[PDB]
Every structure is written in structure tokens, then in C-alpha cells.
Amino acid sequence: STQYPVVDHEFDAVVVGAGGAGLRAAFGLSEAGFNTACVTKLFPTRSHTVAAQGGINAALGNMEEDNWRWHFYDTVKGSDWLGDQDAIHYMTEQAPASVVELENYGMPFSRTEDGKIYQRAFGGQSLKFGKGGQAHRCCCVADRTGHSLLHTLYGRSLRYDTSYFVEYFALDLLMENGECRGVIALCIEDGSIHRIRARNTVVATGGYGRTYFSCTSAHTSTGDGTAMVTRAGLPCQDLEFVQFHPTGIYGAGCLITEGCRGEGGILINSQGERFMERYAPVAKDLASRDVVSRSMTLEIREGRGCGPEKDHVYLQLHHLPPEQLAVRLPGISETAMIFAGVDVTKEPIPVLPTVHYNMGGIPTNYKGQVLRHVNGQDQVVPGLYACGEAACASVHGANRLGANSLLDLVVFGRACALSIAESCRPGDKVPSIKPNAGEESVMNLDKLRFANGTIRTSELRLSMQKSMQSHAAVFRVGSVLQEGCEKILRLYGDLQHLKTFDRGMVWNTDLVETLELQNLMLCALQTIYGAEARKESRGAHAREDFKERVDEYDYSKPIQGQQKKPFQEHWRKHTLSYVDVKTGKVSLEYRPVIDKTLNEADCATVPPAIRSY
Amino acid sequence: SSKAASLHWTGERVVSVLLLGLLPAAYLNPCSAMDYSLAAALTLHGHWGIGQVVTDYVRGDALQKAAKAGLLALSAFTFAGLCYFNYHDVGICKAVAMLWKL
Amino acid sequence: PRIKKFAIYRWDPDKTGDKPHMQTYEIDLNNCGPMVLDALIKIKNEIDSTLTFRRSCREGICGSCAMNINGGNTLACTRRIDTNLDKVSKIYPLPHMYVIKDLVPDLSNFYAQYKSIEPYLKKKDESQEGKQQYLQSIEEREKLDGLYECILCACCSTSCPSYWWNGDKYLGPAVLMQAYRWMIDSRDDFTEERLAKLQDPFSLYRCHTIMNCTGTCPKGLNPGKAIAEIKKMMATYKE
Amino acid sequence: TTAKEEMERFWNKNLGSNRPLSPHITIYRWSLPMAMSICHRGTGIALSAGVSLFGLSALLLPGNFESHLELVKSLCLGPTLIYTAKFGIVFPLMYHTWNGIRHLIWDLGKGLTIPQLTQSGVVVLILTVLSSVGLAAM
Ligand SMILES: *Cc1cc2c(cc1C)nc1c(=O)[nH]c(=O)nc-1n2C[C@H](O)[C@H](O)[C@H](O)COP(=O)(O)OP(=O)(O)OC[C@H]1O[C@@H](n2cnc3c(N)ncnc32)[C@H](O)[C@@H]1O
Ligand code: HEM
Ligand SMILES: O=C(CC(=O)C(F)(F)F)c1cccs1
Ligand SMILES: O=C(CC(=O)C(F)(F)F)c1cccs1
Ligand SMILES: O=C(O)CC[N+](=O)[O-]
Ligand code: SF4
Ligand code: F3S
Ligand code: FES
């Protein structure tokens, strides 16, 4: 310690992450008049949202008549009723205004003949509450909506006085008596340490797909934000619910937007059957992500692969007009060729269900405020917010509806900014900080910095990934899960036998990738454990032991003469997980899901029903 | 505001097409007139030409300012020298002519 | 067994008196990915984890890879390794740029330049923004195709000789193209002032139509073709 | 911080440091277009030098053009040298000429594609040789 001089900055608010969520939160705070700081370990534009292709949902009604309430319904249903309906209400109702806000910012949306934002079909989205038929509200910029979303947002941010700490690694939250005072980070450029303290902190660090071996996410999705919350002793929610995306190149795991299916493409097994019509008649190829992949992954078992080892499947687009694939899916054509070597206009792309999205994250309020659990009740953590994939207001619940994440980013990124602007004023007193705050972080830094262990960082990460890949995949059971838990808890122990080689102060990717490992582990522990404990099948989480949807009641048959099971007797509740940073001991609890909306009169609550597409 | 940079750009193109039409014109119709306009465009075009090379490679207020100055001189003595030649001598056209059937 | 040789540029800022030098690495291509980045990641995790370089999407759309591979600027995660074991791949940092460490260049000036063109929509009346979606015919929209796909890798600009010699005052291909992206967006109302911002001898006019930029874009875009369009507008707009 | 301040910070940080400049011309792969780009200047420069030498000589040196020509006639002028020198003068002029035409066409915004680029380059190169040998015999 004290070998690393510390620089102290002082702002009104701090935003960790410059993705869609972070970015919107940041300039949204400055637009409000707050001296905002934004910490990112990557150049804002390198953020993961750039990879987004599908689009962003919004009941604009450009293709046909629509009602954000139908969007509401589709989303709550798609969550298998583990999603908090109050947040889902807020998100879907704000969607239209949020999308128009983006277009007015300059986002180059694809147009219709009326000159309005072009929208398109997508996974499980209907009209008139699942009765009116396939809906078309997935707004999009050709096939590179994410890339365009992030860029326009970034551009728009240059318009304000926000101080962007580029390529800075957030180490930990500056906590003090249950209140957040800011963050402490490592300036990758010169290896110095900075304590950015503020009145409010917003965590938008993205997901942690990298906890697995095969994922569609970038090498940077290491759940660093989740870890911080965990290190602070705060709970993380539903980390077990990991979304497996159907279409993912057998190779590197790169993604091929579901927009392909919505635009017309299909999925074909070895025998040539459009299986996605057998497992789900109505929705077919265009059903929930959790179901559609659960299908394919299954077909592989029966022995129906479409390549050498019959391990994957085949995504088809061929029958679509070559021009359409050029105006609606130009982005996939490229990578499909570059990573697979295929002419989509005349050949189907090789895809396989791979890790993709994380519904779980930091417990959140529909206002973006982080929650902690006290005496079985929610409590707002003073000066701490979270949004995006890293957050879990849980508008996705047990399964995220395609094209709902980008919306989530923009909506709650705005919500966080608004909650802060509505609860305080710029210039208010910025909390004190002990002259030793963050000392633990620096020490841990210094430690790994000169690690002379026996295990290489890469070796360890590889052990964790393949372990998660084998014990916590699309299908699981107590046996496979428990071996995984102890298997992963075992690796966590090895974090003290790790070897690092680089020891400079400038760009020590060796040091940071290790720091990221520490984070990935904390996420894996909570994912695998919360997974073994959840004995039921809801959304993405499918147990062979319990292929049942254990709710408070049995919503299949009527409800009245039936008795309500005790809270701790059913599984329609969020998983709250903690972990002793020092031993890796996972302890977990649960809290109810919110079923009431913001206004029964404007948007009625949708009671749990049978899950089926 | 003033569009100096853009106008200079177009100016270059103009004398460029002009010096392009003169070469042929100077062949089909050799005359004192041609020898002068050919000397004007030849030196001007060359002046703006080297100019670009100067602003490109010469870094620093001191040097570029001087370079530009020295360039202006060379150009001046060049156009004058050519006009002198067209007046008190054969003229560039007939000079080329003579020089070839040699 | 198929060993491939890799010559890589290196430089440690925290190693007194260290000077730029090439370090060769060997890799069994059967135990690796098809792209150059895969090789980098491999020697990173097994041979020498002191090798530093930027990366993220490994999908070719974030633009973190930008580096010179065999004399050409491209994306390491998209450029497939030369299976010709006889040839030794040469990896260098982006051309004429300050090296922070190994293959990591300082793109601060690059980004700063992008900011100077105000890459965002500007309406004369912003009192009604946020309530209605602006209209734009599919025709007006097609004009953006080939412009908005820019990933900002800096591969083009960092391949332009003019940017090499005057990167301080010359905006470069990347930035200039985006300026054009905003110039022809039917929704923007500051076309005239966007052009006026280029009324000096460096920002735009350092471009001598060399065309290296376009000949190296990892996304098959055409900056040069765009620079030319700007020039034409520059000499024909009024006021 | 503004764009300008950011630029100022950039230079103040790098100029005053032990940071090295990554190689460029020494490592970048040569391409016909790049090469033809260099030659345009070179020729343009050499061409201007010639014209200036002709103008200045006309002001400082004595005697008329003929005094200078006859001066060369009586210099054992070998035919397979009078043509050589005549070619060397026509070569750079023609190259620059044709490539210049190409440059103008580009300003109109045409032919600015990699494919179209190589074609025009070859053409300009061919026209150069033809017009050169052609003129060296007029
Ligand atoms: C993986 C993926 C996801 C995806 C998609 C394609 C791919 C390949 N396509 C989508 C689509 O077409 N439509 C849609 O509705 N969703 C799609 N998704 C899912 C969605 O894009 C993601 O969930 C979302 O983009 C996540 O956004 P978020 O803003 O939360 O996160 P991020 O962009 O991943 O950025 C993370 C930011 O945090 C900073 N960071 C991270 N760790 C640190 C530390 N330690 N210190 C400082 N900063 C940190 C990053 O630098 C970054 O800015
Ligand atoms: C046949 C007639 C000619 C045409 C059509 C022509 C055309 C051009 C064009 C289009 C350029 C600009 C290139 C660019 O964009 O960078 C140029 C530059 C130049 N030309 Fe010519 N030119 C001609 C004759 C000459 C002659 C006879 C000379 C010699 C005195 C000359 C000297 C130059 C120089 C020095 C440059 C500057 C090149 C640079 O920017 O480095 N040109 N010419
Ligand atoms: O008769 C002429 C004149 C001519 O082409 C020019 F006038 F120079 F353009 C020439 C004779 C030898 C070379 S050019
Ligand atoms: O200064 C240069 C660059 C040059 O020669 C190189 F391209 F770098 F090889 C040039 C400027 C105008 C045409 S070439
Ligand atoms: O993430 C998803 O399930 C669908 C969106 N993406 O475009 O494919
Ligand atoms: S134009 Fe092409 S090279 Fe130049 S940054 Fe945009 S992507 Fe890269
Ligand atoms: S290399 Fe440059 S010089 Fe012009 S064409 Fe492309 S910007
Ligand atoms: S890492 Fe993203 S483009 Fe190559």
C-alpha cells in the first residue's frame, strides 16, 4: 500500500459503465444539472451494446395499431411470473417516449413508407393480450441497432460537461454504514488509484456471460459490478436464471440476431424437420428464448445434429429474398461468412444454443434504487442505483423477451437519473470518507499484482468456465448441480494459488484480467448455488428433477377452494444470494415478486397462468 | 464566414484544366499569345503545387512562413524569366519546337 | 502439428531503458482459433501474459482490435492467420501513433477530433424534441448506408500519410466521413455550419486522395469517396 | 473538458514522455495507388524545378536560346542519347499529365472504389508509356 498514490475526485454522481444504460444515466444526470463522473474500463463505444442487432421494443404502432399494455402483458408472461409487474409497467409505458427520444437524438432507424420508425416481429410478442396475433413493435436500425444505439448516445453525451474517466477499472464501492459514497478505481493508463466520491452512484457494468465457456458476450462481460455489490455484503438477485440464446455459431459463439427468425428465417434439424413447430405449434420458430433453445438442445440429445459430431443445428434464411437479407440482416451475413464461411442468400447458418443474457443482477427498485433485504422486507440502499443487464429490477424475471434489454437500458438509465434529480439537488453535501476508504481494494490489488503462485490466471478461468458449462447448462439436476457447486467452490479456493507474470504499472491486462477472474468467480458461485436450490422449472431454469412450476397456488385449475402454500413452501420468489468474500460461502434467502402494477386502473395485474407458446 | 480554403481548392482545379487545354492548344496553334498564357498557368499551377507540398512537410510557424516566402520569390523570378524569354527571345513554343528537331 | 511463427512489436513503459523490439512466438495452429486475435489471446494465456492489447467483441464490430497485421491495418479478430507456415506474421501497433505499451496506441487525439465535428443531430428548434418521431423517407435514409456503420477503429485514419504527417490539425478519414454522415442526414439543420467548420487549410484539405483509408477499412466502407463528396459540397454551398 | 482542451492535453502528455512512435512507412504494405500517389508529387516537383530552371536561366545566363542549342549540337550528340534525354523529359510530364486527369475525375467524385482504382492506375500507366515513346519521336 501507499506504494500506489491515491487521487481524490469529488462529484455529485458517479456512473460505472458507459454502455447503453450507463451512457443514458450519465448524460441524463448532467442534462439535469449534476456534476457527473462516468467510469469505464473501455472506450464507451467499445461497450457490449454495440453487438446488439435485433432491436428495441416500443408500442409505437407504426406497423399496425398497438397498445403498450399488450407489450406489458407479453413481457410479464414471458417472465414466467417471476418478473415484478410494477417495473414491467413502468418500462413498457415509457418505451414509446424512450424510443422517440433516441430517434430525436439522431439514431438512424430504418424507415417505413410513411417515414416512420420501422418495427418488426420478434420472439413471443402478440396483440390484444395474446389473442390478436403476432405483433410488430421491434424498432430497429437495419441489423446493427445496438451499435447505432450506443454511438448516438455517446455522441449525444459529448454535448454535456460529464467527466468521463476512460479505461478506468472500478475496484469496489466506497461504502460507509450502509451508504454508498462513490467508487475506487484503477487508472489502467498509469496504474494509479482514484477514489471518486459522490452523493449518488449508478452501477451499469453489464452482465457476466464470461463465467461460461461458450457465450455470445464479449471478453469484457465479467460482471465486475455484481462483484462489487457482493463484496459490499449486499444481495444479488436470481443469478441462476441465465438465458441461453438459440442461434450461436458452433465456433467462437458469436451471435446471429433472433431478428433472422422474425424476418422469416427458420431452424432445421438434421432430419430436416422444422422441429420448432412440434415443440410449439402457434409461436413456432418465434417463441420464448428459454423454450426455443430448450428445444434445440434437446434435439441434439436424440441424436440429430447437423455437422461432423452432430453437436449443433442449422439456422436457415435461404428462402428469403436476397435483397431482404441485405436490408434487414446485413450484419449477420458478414459474420456468418467471416466466422462460418456462408452465403446466407443460398445457405443456412450453423447455430447452437449458447449463454447470452443475464436476467439476474443487483436487486433494484422500479426507480433504479438498489435494494437490500431486512426482516423479510425491502430497504433502499442510500445513494446507490443500478440499471441494465447488471441490474435486476427484474422486468425480465425468469426469462427476457427478445428486444427488451436495449429498452431496459434506456428506460432505467433514465429512471436512475430522474430518481436522483427528483430526490436531491446538484451541489448538495457530498458525504465524508475515511482517509483509509478502499484500503482493502488496493491491498487486494497489490496482492494479485505480484502473485507468485502456481496456477495461471487463464488456467483457473478455464476451469471455472468449463465447469459452469457442464454443470449449469440448459438442463440440470441436483447431482450434476451439487458436483458443480463443490467443484466451483473448489476453484474459488485456488484463487490464492494463482500466478501472474506482468508486474508493471501501465496497462497490466495481466492484473486486470485476474481482477476480473475474482469477479467472475463470485458470480459463478451464486449462479450455480442458487440454481441447485431452486427445485422447480420456470423460464430458463429447467430442472429434470422438478419439471414443475411451483407457485403459491396451482394456477392450472381454478382458485378459491384451493389453499395458498406458505411463502417458504413454493418457488415463485426471487433468489437472494450473498457470499463470504473470504471463504466463498454462499448463503441465500428470498423475497416476494411484485404483482401489483403502478395503477390497476391503467394497467391491470396479470395473474400467473400456464406457460406455453 | 469567408470560404477561402474552398475557393483556393477550386482555383487549383480550374488552372489545372486550363493548363490541360493549353498544352494541346499550344501545339495546334503556336503563337506569342500561347507562350504567355502558357507561362502564366505553368508558373501559377506550379506555385500552388509546391505550396501544398510545403504546408504538408514544413512544420513550425517560423519555417513555413519563410518557406512560403522563398517559394513566392522563386515563382516570381520564374514567371518573369519566362516572360523575358517570350519577349527578348524565341518563346517557349518555338523553343520546344527547335529543341525537338535536334 | 502445424507451427506458425509470430513476430510481435513490444515495449514496456515500466522497464527502464527498454526500446521498441520484435519478439517472436510460435503456435500450434491446430490448438488455436482461425483469427489473429485467437493467436494473441493464446500466447497471452499460455506463453506470455505480459503481452498487452485491446480486445472485446472478437466479432468485428466494437473496433478494439485495430492494429497493423502484415503491413495492413485491420481487425485482429477478423483477419484470419496465414496458414503458410513458411511466412512469419508481423504484428505492429497502428501506424504513426504514440505507443502506450506494446500494441496499445493512444487514441485520445483521434477521439477528440471526432468530438469537434459535433456527431449528433442538431435541429434549429429543439423545443419539440422527445414527443414525436421525426419523418425520413426511405430514400433520405439510404443516403446513410455505408456511412453510419463506422466502428471507429481508426484503421483508415491511421493508414493515411497525411494523417501521419499532420494528424494534429488534419481530421483524418474516419472523422471526416462521420462529418459527412451528419451533413447529409435530412433531419439535421446545420449542414451549412458543418461545412464552414472545415474552412481552413488542414481539417479537410490535407487529403490528397491517396485512398489508403478505403483500401484498408475492415468494414468495407469508403472514407475517401466521402471526403470527395464533402469537397464538392464545400465548393458549391451558398453563404 | 472540451475537444480543444483534450487535444492540448494529448500533446502535452506525449511530447513530454518516453513514449515511442509506432513505425509507419517502414512497415505499411505498398500498393500501386500509394506508389502512384508518391510519383505524382515527385514528378510535379521535378517538373516545377525544370520550369524554374528554364525561367531563371533566361534571366541570369548570357546568350539566346539558339546560342545554347548550337552549343549542344556541337557536343557529339549521340542519337541513342538525344532520344534518351528527350524521353526522360517527356516521361515525368506525361505521367503527371495523365495521372492529373485521373485526379480531376476523382474530384468529380467518380472512380473512387478499390476496383475502379486499380484499373485507372494501370490505364494511366499505359497511356504514360505510349505518349512518352510517341512524343520522343515527334
Ligand atoms: C451479448 C449480446 C447481447 C445482446 C445482443 C447481442 C450480443 C452479442 N443483441 C441484442 C439485441 O439485438 N436486442 C436486445 O434487445 N438485446 C440484445 N442483447 C442483450 C443486451 O444488448 C445487453 O443486455 C445490454 O447491451 C447490456 O447493456 P449494459 O449497458 O448494461 O452493458 P454493457 O454495454 O455490456 O456495458 C458494460 C459497461 O460497463 C463498463 N464496465 C464493466 N466492468 C467495469 C469495471 N470493472 N470498471 C469500470 N467500468 C466497467 C464497461 O466498460 C461498459 O461501458
Ligand atoms: C498536363 C497538365 C497538368 C495537369 C492536368 C495537372 C494536374 C494536377 C492536379 C490535378 C494536381 C493535384 C493533385 C492532388 O490532388 O494532390 C496537380 C499537382 C501538382 N502539379 Fe500538376 N498538372 C499538369 C501539369 C503540371 C506541370 C507542367 C507541372 C510543373 C511545373 C506541374 C506541377 C505540379 C505540382 C508541383 C503539383 C503539386 C502536387 C502535390 O500536391 O504534391 N503540373 N497537378
Ligand atoms: O512543332 C512543335 C510544337 C508543339 O507541339 C508545342 F507547341 F510545343 F505544343 C514541336 C516540335 C518538337 C516538339 S514539339
Ligand atoms: O507525403 C505523402 C505520403 C507518401 O509519400 C507515402 F504515402 F507515405 F508513402 C504524400 C502526399 C501527397 C501525395 S503522397
Ligand atoms: O436476446 C435475444 O433473445 C433476442 C435478440 N437478439 O437480437 O437476437
Ligand atoms: S471507416 Fe472504416 S477504418 Fe476508418 S474507423 Fe470507420 S471502420 Fe474503421
Ligand atoms: S488515405 Fe487520406 S489522403 Fe485522403 S483518401 Fe484516404 S483521406
Ligand atoms: S475485438 Fe472487437 S472488433 Fe475485434
**Residues spanned by CATH 3.90.700.10 within chain A?**
249-352
Closest residue on chain D to C117 (Cα): D3
Domain residue ranges in chain C? 1-106, 107-239
Ligand 5 within 6 A of A402 CB? yes
Ligand 1 shell residues, CB under 6 Å:
A 16-22, 39-42, 47-49, 51-55, 145-146, 169-170, 204-206, 216-217, 221, 224, 255, 257, 357, 388-390, 403-406, 409
For residue A23, the ligand 1 atom closest to its alpha carbon is 29
With b for 16 or more beta-carbon neighbours within 10 A and e for fewer, the A208-241 pattern comes to: bbbbbbbbbbbbbbbbbbbbbbbbbebbbbbbbb
Q: Say which residues have a Cβ less than 8 Å from residue C146's Cβ, sequence separation at least 6.
A: C221, C222
Give the separation between CA A371 and CA C69, rounded to whole angstroms: 49
Least Cα distance to A146 among A407, A378, A324, A390 occurs for: A407
**Residues spanned by CATH 3.50.50.60 within chain A?**
1-248+353-431
Mutate to test the pocket of ligand 4, among C156, C160, C170, C210 (most ligand atoms within 8 A of CB): C210
DSSP D74: T
Q: Say which residues have a Cβ less than 8 Å from residue C174's Cβ, sequence separation at least 6.
A: C110, C114, C150, C152, C154, C156, C157, C213, C223
Query: Are D56 and D100 part of one and the same domain?
Result: yes
Beta-sheet pairing, C72-74 with C67-69: antiparallel
Least Cα distance to A207 among A223, A226, A183, A219 occurs for: A223
Strands (E), chain C: 3-10, 21-28, 67-69, 72-74, 88-92, 99-101, 104-105
Partner-chain contact B82 D58, CB within 8 Å: yes
Q: Taking the CA of residue C1 as centre, how many other CA atoms within 13 Å lie in the half-sphere pointing to its CB? A: 2
Tell me the three state secondary structure of residue A588.
strand
Name the CA dihedral angle for A488, A490, A492, A496, rounded to a multiple of 10 degrees: -160
Query: Do A19 and A48 contact (CB within 8 A), yes or no?
Result: yes
**Residues spanned by CATH 1.20.58.100 within chain A?**
432-548
Name the CA dihedral angle for A270, A276, A279, A280, rounded to a multiple of 10 degrees: -170
For residue A565, the tally of other CB atoms under 10 A from its CB is 15
**Level-2 CATH architecture, domain A432-548:** Up-down Bundle (1.20)
The whole domain housing D12 covers 1-30
DSSP A152: H
How far is residue A278 CA from its own chain's centroid?
30
Rg (CA), chain C: 21
Residues linked to residue A590 through DSSP beta bridges, in sequence order:
A575
Give the separation between CA B43 and CA B80, rounded to whole angstroms: 10
Least Cα distance to A409 among A11, A17, A12 occurs for: A17
Residue C62 touches partner A, C-beta closer than 8 Å: yes
Sole residue written with cell 504499472 = A505
Query: Are D82 and D23 part of one and the same domain?
Result: no
Residue range C1-106, CATH number: 3.10.20.30
Give the separation between CA D6 and CA D3, rounded to whole angstroms: 5
Active site residues of A: 289
Give the separation between CA A451 and CA A514, rounded to whole angstroms: 10
Query: Do C154 and C107 contact (CB within 8 A), yes or no?
Result: yes
CB-count exposure of residue A570 (10 Å: 0-12, 13-18, 19+):
middle
Give the separation between CA A193 and CA A221, rounded to whole angstroms: 22
Taking contacts as CB-CB distances below 8 angstroms, the residues of chain A near C111 are 43
Query: Are D86 and D35 part of one and the same domain?
Result: yes
Residues linked to residue A179 through DSSP beta bridges, in sequence order:
A176
Amino acid residing at D19: R
Q: Which three cell numbers stand for residue A538?
A: 420456470
Q: Which three cell numbers stand for residue A50?
A: 454495440
Nearest CB neighbour to D109, from listed C115, C212, C232: C232
For residue A185, the ligand 1 atom closest to its alpha carbon is 46
Residue C149 touches partner A, C-beta closer than 8 Å: yes
Indicate the helix (H) or strand (E) that contains A154: helix A145-157
CATH fold, domain A549-613, is Rhinovirus 14, subunit 4 (4.10.80)
Ligand 3 within 6 A of B100 CB? yes
Rg (CA), chain B: 16
Query: Do A154 and A22 contact (CB within 8 A), yes or no?
Result: no
- At least 3 CB pairs under 8 A between chains B and D: yes
For residue A298, the tally of other CB atoms under 10 A from its CB is 15
Tell me the three state secondary structure of residue A355.
strand
Residues linked to residue A359 through DSSP beta bridges, in sequence order:
none
Q: How many residues does chain C have?
A: 239
Amino acid residing at A335: T
Partner-chain contact C61 A144, CB within 8 Å: yes
Amino acid residing at A507: W
Taking contacts as CB-CB distances below 8 angstroms, the residues of chain C near B60 are none
Give the separation between CA A11 and CA A29, rounded to whole angstroms: 12
Query: Do B52 and B58 contact (CB within 8 A), yes or no?
Result: no
Least Cα distance to A285 among A299, A258, A267, A297 occurs for: A267
Domains contained in chain D, number: 2
Tell me the three state secondary structure of residue C121.
coil
Nearest CB neighbour to C109, from listed D10, D34, D109: D10
Give the separation between CA C120 and CA A218, rounded to whole angstroms: 27
Residue B10 touches partner C, C-beta closer than 8 Å: yes
- Domains of chain B are 1-102 (1.20.1300.10)
Write the residue with the smallest CA distance to atom 10 of ligand 3: B97
Sole residue written with cell 479505461 = A167
Chain A nearest CA to C91, separation (Å): 18
Least Cα distance to A453 among A498, A506, A511 occurs for: A498
For residue C163, the ligand 7 atom closest to its alpha carbon is 2
Q: Which three cell numbers stand for residue C213?
A: 483509408
Q: Which three cell numbers stand for residue A384?
A: 446507490
In degrees, rounded to 5, the angle at the alpha carbon of residue A316 between the alpha carbons of residues A311 and A321 is 165
Give the separation between CA A23 and CA A16, rounded to whole angstroms: 9
In degrees, rounded to 5, the angle at the alpha carbon of residue A393 between the alpha carbons of residues A387 and A396 is 105
Chain B nearest CA to C176, separation (Å): 15
For residue A199, the tally of other CB atoms under 10 A from its CB is 26
* Contacts within 8 Å (CB) and 24+ apart, D77-80: D77/B102
How far apart, in Å, do the first and last CA atoms of chain A sit?
57
Q: Say which residues have a Cβ less than 8 Å from residue A6's Cβ, sequence separation at least 6.
A: A192, A193, A194, A195, A438, A442
Residue D66 touches partner C, C-beta closer than 8 Å: no
- Put residue C212 in one of left, alpha, beta given phi > 0 → left and psi -120 to 50 → alpha: alpha
Q: How many H helices and E strands in chain C?
A: 7, 7
Closest residue on chain D to C234 (Cα): D107
Tell me the three state secondary structure of residue B26.
helix
Ligand 3 within 6 A of B3 CB? no
How far is residue D100 CA from its own chain's centroid?
10
Write the residue with the smallest CA distance to atom 8 of ligand 4: C161
Nearest CB neighbour to B57, from listed C165, C204, C231: C165
Q: Which three cell numbers stand for residue C102?
A: 506494446
Compute CA distances C64 → A42, C38, C157, C161, whole Å.
9, 14, 15, 22
Query: Are D118 and D61 part of one and the same domain?
Result: yes
CB-count exposure of residue A592 (10 Å: 0-12, 13-18, 19+):
middle
Q: Which three cell numbers stand for residue D34?
A: 500509394
Which DSSP string do the residues of C67-80 spell out, in sequence order?
EEETTEEE-TTTSB
Q: Which three cell numbers stand for residue C48?
A: 506470455
For residue C210, the tally of other CB atoms under 10 A from its CB is 22
Which CATH number goes with the domain that contains D124?
1.20.1300.10
In degrees, rounded to 5, the angle at the alpha carbon of residue A240 between the alpha carbons of residues A239 and A244 is 105
Partner-chain contact A106 C185, CB within 8 Å: yes
- At least 3 CB pairs under 8 A between chains A and B: no
Partner-chain contact B7 C162, CB within 8 Å: no
From the candidates C203, C234, C237, C239, which should be mutated to test the interface with B, based on the most B CB atoms within 10 A? C234
Query: Are D6 and D45 part of one and the same domain?
Result: no
Q: Say which residues have a Cβ less than 8 Å from residue A309's Cβ, sequence separation at least 6.
A: none
Tell me the three state secondary structure of residue A183.
strand
Method: X-ray
Least Cα distance to C145 among A46, A326, A149, A137 occurs for: A326
Taking contacts as CB-CB distances below 8 angstroms, the residues of chain C near B52 are 208
Which DSSP string do the residues of D80-129 spell out, in sequence order?
HHHHHHHHHHHHHHHHHHHHHHHHHHHHTT-S-SHHHHHHHHHHHHHHHH
Query: Do A540 and A399 contact (CB within 8 A), yes or no?
Result: yes
For residue D34, the ligand 4 atom closest to its alpha carbon is 7
- The sheet carrying A236-237 orders its strands as A236-237, A574-579, A586-591
Least Cα distance to D41 among D94, D96, D93, D89 occurs for: D96
Partner-chain contact A45 C152, CB within 8 Å: yes
Give the sign of the dihedral formed by CA C63, CA C67, CA C69, CA C74: positive
Mutate to test the pocket of ligand 7, among C158, C212, C225, C231 (most ligand atoms within 8 A of CB): C212
Compute CA distances C239 → A339, B1, C10, C124, C193, whole Å.
50, 8, 52, 17, 10
Chain D nearest CA to B75, separation (Å): 7
Least Cα distance to D20 among C11, C91, C158 occurs for: C11
Q: Which three cell numbers stand for residue A207?
A: 452482465
What is A1-248+353-431's CATH number, 3.50.50.60, 3.90.600.10, 3.30.420.10, 1.10.10.10? 3.50.50.60
From the candidates C62, C135, C145, C221, which should be mutated to test the interface with A, based on the most A CB atoms within 10 A? C62
Give the separation between CA A207 and CA A217, rounded to whole angstroms: 9
Least Cα distance to A132 among A55, A82, A57, A59 occurs for: A59
Query: Do A38 and A164 contact (CB within 8 A), yes or no?
Result: yes
Residue range A249-352, CATH number: 3.90.700.10
Tell me the three state secondary structure of residue A175.
strand
Give the separation between CA A84 and CA A101, rounded to whole angstroms: 25
Q: How many H helices and E strands in chain A?
A: 14, 24
Nearest CB neighbour to C134, from listed A99, A103, A114: A103
Q: Which three cell numbers stand for residue A539?
A: 423460464
Nearest CB neighbour to C20, from listed D6, D20, D24: D20
Give the separation between CA A47 and CA A43, rounded to whole angstroms: 7
CATH fold, domain C107-239, is Fumarate Reductase Iron-sulfur Protein; Chain B, domain 2 (1.10.1060)
Strands (E), A359-407: 362-363, 369-374, 377-386, 391-392
CB-count exposure of residue A418 (10 Å: 0-12, 13-18, 19+):
middle
Q: Say which residues have a Cβ less than 8 Å from residue A462's Cβ, sequence separation at least 6.
A: A213, C45
Residues linked to residue A13 through DSSP beta bridges, in sequence order:
A36, A200
Residue C165 touches partner B, C-beta closer than 8 Å: yes
Give the sign of the dihedral formed by CA A390, CA A392, CA A397, CA A402: negative
Q: Which three cell numbers stand for residue D50?
A: 525544370
Give the relative orientation of helices D79-107 and B4-28 as an angle to the nearest 10 degrees: 140
Chains that touch A (3 or more CB pairs under 8 A): C
